[PDB]
Write a protein that binds this ligand. Structure first.
Ligand code: A1H3Y
Length: 207
């Protein structure tokens, strides 16, 4: 595996951003986290991150045990929390060669317990032979907008970091007609010293 994706489904872009109210005068958006996929990756053993996500019934080890292991990835984000009352959004684009309908479940876990879940469905859209699946500008759920504001306030980066130590997200992309899991992505978090912007690192999850 050489990127965040498998032979059926590839992630083209993902980001979480905020556009300030000024955006409609002169445009700007701040990116908290951004993957852009316009040697093989490193491994991380899935057993390491079991206790960071729910247990079974929608949890990592029940999923990884139903395979396929090449579908599972870990993304460590370094979030840029340096940027009230604007638009907070999330944007996902995937690409395949097969025509499919997709269900994208994203579960937000605090201390390894689902706190908020969103489930969307995106039908494929033919383009240059490939199919594009576009879930652009989904409004960020108000738990995360609140959470981010709270995190912005903490007095020290190392406190944000230990708070974020217990904050993970699990995205599960499944073929809605088949139920075949196509992509599973666990997200762990730290903050970035915002001269450096958002950064990230993508691993394969193995055993
Ligand atoms: O409404 C669902 C939103 C969503 C699904 N999957 C995601 C993956 C990342 C992410 O960024 C938020 C974040 C940035 C910095 C620190 C903590 C959280 C948001 C989402």
């Amino acid at each position: 595996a050489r990127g965040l994706g498998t032979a059926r489904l590839q992630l083209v872009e993902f980001s979480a951003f905020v556009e300030p109210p000024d955006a409609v005068d002169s445009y700007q958006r701040h990116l908290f986290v951004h993957i852009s996929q316009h040697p093989p990756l490193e491994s991380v053993d899935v057993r390491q991150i079991y206790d960071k996500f729910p247990e079974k019934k929608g949890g990592l080890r029940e999923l990884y045990d139903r395979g396929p292991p090449h579908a599972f990835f870990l993304v460590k984000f370094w979030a840029d929390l340096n940027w009230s009352g604007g638009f907070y959004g999330v944007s996902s684009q995937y690409e395949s060669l097969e025509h499919m309908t997709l269900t994208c479940s994203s579960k937000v876990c605090s201390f390894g317990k689902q706190v908020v879940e969103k489930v969307e469905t995106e039908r494929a859209q033919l383009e240059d032979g490939r199919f594009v699946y576009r879930l652009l500008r989904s409004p960020m759920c108000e738990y995360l907008v609140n959470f981010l504001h709270k995190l912005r306030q903490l007095p020290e980066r190392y406190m944000m970091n230990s708070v974020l130590e217990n904050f993970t997200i699990l995205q599960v992309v499944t073929n809605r007609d088949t139920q075949e899991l196509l992509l599973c992505t666990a997200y762990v978090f730290e903050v970035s010293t915002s001269e450096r912007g958002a950064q990230h690192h993508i691993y394969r999850l193995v055993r």
